[model samples]
Target chain A: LIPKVSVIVPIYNVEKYLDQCVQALLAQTLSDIEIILIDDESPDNCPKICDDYAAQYPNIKVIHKKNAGLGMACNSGLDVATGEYVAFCDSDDYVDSDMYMTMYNVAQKYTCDAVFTFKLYKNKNEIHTLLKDLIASDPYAREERAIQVSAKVVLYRRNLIEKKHLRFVSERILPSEDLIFNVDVLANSNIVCVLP
Target chain B: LIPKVSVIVPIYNVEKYLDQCVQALLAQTLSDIEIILIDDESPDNCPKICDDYAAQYPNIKVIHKKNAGLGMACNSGLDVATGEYVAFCDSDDYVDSDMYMTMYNVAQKYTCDAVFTFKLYKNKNEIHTLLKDLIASDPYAREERAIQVSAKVVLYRRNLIEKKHLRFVSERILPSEDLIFNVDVLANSNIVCVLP
Candidate 1:
């Protein structure tokens, strides 16, 4: 069965948040989604957690590999993703249940190469809005004219990644990896959709 | 004698680049400036470099303190700064010669709380243009309408920091402390002067 969306989660030593993060995804309203958990040889029980989730859920696929940085782990997950659309979630962060459902619907309805949604930052018992304005803005056809979006809440067409061979930069992996990767993906994308 | 500007440089284990960075400051065309070198117990030869520059130049002041992170080091420098305006330069990065002169003139002429300029990023072998266009854009006036500026290329009124008791957040002590500090400063200031 071809899933509509492949959610790639790069798991490291986030043992404390793994269960909560995976639970949120499994309980998502969107059913036609494959959850790909790539463990980057975390020095914790994260691999066991991934395997446990894989056994519990049919749609959850777990891949355990040698320790790599976040960028490499993401790339590895991207290689085995089998879906029409792809979304990335960090191991430390959990998303709202409706996140994938809304993104998938928007991508399928508008035939967009990319779709972005709002992000809520939770720190120290405070919830802060991160990209509300960008998500509220209407989708733009031209890549340059489109609104900026963070990678955490973005959904991209599988073909855009596979066809362009647009992977994160191998070097210069310090501070601006997300900015560089987003710029590369945006440059190659045709139409971008925004959802709140 | 009161200096027009105070340049705060927080030094850690930047022994490889301290001499070059201090030399660039000494070569600046802006003579009416006090260079404050805060040595945060760097286990390298950076303390000796700071001391040598202090002995050679009347405008240079060296502060030897216990090892704290970059945020606390900058805070110590801010406490003793004796200029009307303050600016920060990373010990690892060298600034252009006309940096202080150009920024001070613009801030004084426009009666602005802050002045922002452009910068060039240099790695070991190559130079990259970082903020040419953003700095070249039209200057904004109102606090609500201020433009984004990097801390390294910004000259800020010392009074603003003193009045607001502005200090860097110690908990989230990533390299992004400057970004958060800049946002806070801009939010509090009324008038900002941008340079091309």
Candidate 2:
């Protein structure tokens, strides 16, 4: 059976923080989630860590590939993702246990192409003035709302990604491939939800 | 002598707006600027229009090529630009006669890598809150200020673009190549100025 969400983590020399990040993903309240660990030829023990996690966890998978930048690593994860929706996390960054659950529920409720949250874990009361009641026709408003640089906070529908042929541009070609990917995804999205 | 600025206009099927756009470029107060009109094999009189403009004006040059999307056309212009700074103008969009002059002067005064202006012609008094006094370390603030989607409203240093190897992503791969290009440029830029 397919998972509800695919959590992709592009790992590099982040052995120190890998356990924390993977633990957070494993502890998600949304249990029907698959964790993809892309080992970008990290010159560290991340490979062993990923291997051990995958060995213990039925839903955990690992991909060992030649050293590519973040963008390509993310693309490799995207290539194998078999979930209804996709989320990204950096190996050094850990999230709340309820993060995916909250976001996934919001996605289901609104049937949105993507869901964005404020960087703060709490403080949902402070809604951005521009983000309130944004219309699809308004490009500038959309651009303002999609300013979250890291793809970690956004939950994207995998169908939308496949349909739009959306993938990350190489970090070598241009840095901040995360920002570019998010912007493009938001642009093509028909409906987007924001959670505080 | 190197031109103070190079204006790149990517042309398509908008034959009606081409003349107005070219006229605006010609009327720029910065007489040392070169205008590069990329005729993307438009199925209209745009090719003839570009050629006539090139023949009539010493500063105006035209490149006729098979139709690629807007991003590639802009790349074609960037390949041959020989100026200190580069500016982009859409073939269907016209700008004020003093736009480039004002932006170029601001760039010189601040010795900044780029300069951005508000969309409105005379409403410089209404500075965006996030854009005010932005620090380089603040990625969110920088992203917010760089929301101007079209590349037309900003002037970028040619050297910065070249050094960073910045180019527009293909529209087919991802729409809004302009935003991605601008964002990458802004991210790499050391000093950026905003004109009211």
Candidate 3:
């Protein structure tokens, strides 16, 4: 089955936020989606949570492997993803229920190579803007814009990755691994749609 | 005369703020410093201002050239700087008078490769907090920290560039050039000091 969207989530020791992250995906407005949760040998009960979600949802696939850091876990999820469009969400962060739905609609409507949305960093209490204000106000309609795309909030067409043979550089191993990866991907993309 | 500190200010078309920028630099508490103003082919009268400052202050030197963007402008200044330690300040923004003195004192006292200081970001009429609260709370001093060394608000040993042949990469261009350059320089340095 070709899922409309493949959500790659790399899970570590985020047991506290595991259920919320899964529940958010389950409640997404987009129904034809596959959740690929790769557990990187988390010391917490995150692996059990991944198994529980796989049992509950037919489209939820969980892969358990020895700890290899976030970059490798993401690579592991990418290896098994089977969808026309792919996106990533960190286990510690939960997205809005309409995130995937909005991205899918935007990508299909414009036939874009990638679709990008804004992200909000959630602290203990309040939410702060991510890279939203970095670009112009009309970023969505801008053509060949130079704004940096966040990996967590971007929806990429499968062919854009496989055809170009693009993959994240595992050696850069830092918290900003996604930033570097997304920069490389965006450089090669022909058309990208930015969402407000 | 060997200046204690070399201040490199990369300017493009920021004529409106040129006077204020120069005034801030001239008013620095650390008087034994050479100010290198690289004018990157600004269409405005910014070149005139740079020349005016060069004539007024014996320690101020101006480089006028065709626009090669920020990265190249800094590289031009770096090529000619003759100071024991070097620091970069953006032309659009002005720094506190004591900024150079504080950083210089810290680096001299500790005999470290670099000294990092907090900064205050001002946009329009609003002033954002300095040294972000979250980062200040969990200050971890290590021999080799993983954070990127920003060109702004940091003092680096001049020999790191002159003696070691460490220079910024022109190919990477804008945006992430600082990240790459700073990472390379920091990785090679032995002692790095973080000042609050």
Candidate 4:
């Protein structure tokens, strides 16, 4: 059965946080989501950890690829993803348990090409300020917003991504490749929803 | 002496337009500019043409690299570029004689990180409409403008590019890689000037 979302996590020597991230994905309320663990030839125990998870969980998939940068690793996972929507998670970062469920629901409800989640602090004032900046009418403000944000806080429609032929820039050649990816996604998205 | 601008043209199998493009660059009023013709392993006679130009012209340089996509070819040119500002030209595209001079003057006068030239039709209304859309304060308009335009129309400061470690995305994995490169440059640029 095709999954609702495919979560691509690029593993690269982040063994310390790899298990925690995988556990968080397993705990996600969106049980229909498939977890793709891309072991980017990590010179550590990440490959074994990834394989262990894949062996135990039916929905978990593991890909062991040569050391291409994080962006290429994600692309390898993306090439094999068979899901309605695609989400990216850093191996070193863990998401909230309800993150996928909330994002997917909002995406479906609004028919959004992409959905952005504000992974910010609990401070109301800070959140308010950030939201205002993001939704601002000023062109410079929007440009700044896209550049500053990471690609991790969004769920992208697989159709739009496939249609636009969007892929992440390799971090080996350019750092902050996620920001470039987010900017491209923002430019192409027709409808986008934000959740605080 | 450091040149005012380094124009990088990535040539790949465009033998027909190679000489015309080279002639246009050679005819430029900006005599202080350097021309870098990157031969991306084109099976055509373009490599010989590039080498001939490099042999004859003191300010012209050529790099013959294995077949990488257009973006990576530009990156190869960028690695050896030593000029105050940098510009990209496709092998099949040619610029006006005064293009570099005008762009360089604007960049220096405004202390701009980049300068964009409107490579549009001679139609007055069309040019005006495009300029309006590009300069619009609406964030969506700006986002659309960046996505629709190619990177060839801009002259970028080498300092800013080097400082940010900006590199083009390979077109092999993703098409319209120039648009992504332009977006990254736009986000990082502090001051940008536009010429009609």
Interface RMSD of 4: 10.5
Q: Which structure among the candidates has the greatest DockQ?
A: 1
- Looking at candidate 4 chain B, the ten consecutive residues that score lowest on lDDT are B119-128
Q: Encode model 2's per-residue lDDT on A121-144: one tens digit a residue.
A: 122223323333122223333334
Model 4: residues >4 Å from true position, as ranges? A1-196, B118-143, B147-151
Measured against the true structure, the TM-scores of the candidates, in listed sequence, are 0.54, 0.49, 0.49, 0.51
lDDT per residue, candidate 1, B1-196, as tens digits? 7888999999989999988998888888987888999999999998998899999989999999998877888899999998999988888888889878888887777666777654222221111012222112122111112123432578989998888777764423333345446545654566665566
- Model 2 agreement with the true structure over B113-170: per-residue lDDT tens digits: 7887533212222332323312222334334444543335789899988876678766
lDDT of 2: 0.75
Total clashes for model 1: 0
For candidate 3 chain B, the 10 contiguous residues with the lowest summed lDDT are B134-143
The true-versus-predicted C-alpha distance at residue B46 of model 4, in Å, is 1.3
DockQ of 2: 0.03
lDDT of 3 by residue, B2-117 (tens): 89899899898899998998899889999799999999999999999999889988899999988787778888989889989998888877888998888888778767666765
**Candidate 3: which pairs clash?**
none
Q: Put down candidate 1 lDDT per residue, A1-196, tens digits, no spaces.
A: 7888899998888999989888888889988889999998989999999999899889998889988677777788889899998888978777888888888887777677777664322231211122221112122211112223433588889888888775654322323244345545554555666565
Q: How far is B159's C-alpha from truth in model 2 (Å)?
A: 18
Q: What is the DockQ of each candidate?
A: 0.09, 0.03, 0.03, 0.03
Per-residue alpha-carbon lDDT of model 3 for A116-149, expressed as tens digits?
7643222312211222222222223111222344
